[PDB]
Design a protein around this ligand. Structure first.
Ligand SMILES: [Zn+2]
Ligand SMILES: [Zn+2]
Ligand SMILES: [Zn+2]
Ligand SMILES: [Zn+2]
Lengths: 7, 67
């Protein structure tokens, strides 16, 4: 899943 | 071209449910804010009802508003 960190 | 969000003007001291946690508006713990693969809103795993105790391993994730 994507997180704000990886986005 | 900034700020990236016109609702809060990227003010890190302001809560924002548009570019930060869509539930609480909090910017803390970005590594725990899941991004919806449909609407691209962010959700702290701990703000979800029920809360998730960890970030899901599945590649895609859809928020409560998108299914
Ligand atoms: Zn914002
Ligand atoms: Zn939250
Ligand atoms: Zn969504
Ligand atoms: Zn919403």
């Amino acid at each position: 899943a994507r997180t704000k960190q990886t986005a | 071209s900034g700020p990236s969000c016109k609702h809060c003007k990227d003010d890190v001291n302001r809560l924002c449910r548009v570019c930060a946690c869509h539930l609480c508006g909090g910017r803390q713990d970005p590594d725990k804010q899941l991004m919806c693969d449909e609407c691209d809103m962010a959700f702290h795993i701990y703000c979800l009802d029920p809360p998730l105790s960890s970030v899901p391993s599945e590649d895609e994730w859809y928020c409560p508003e998108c299914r």
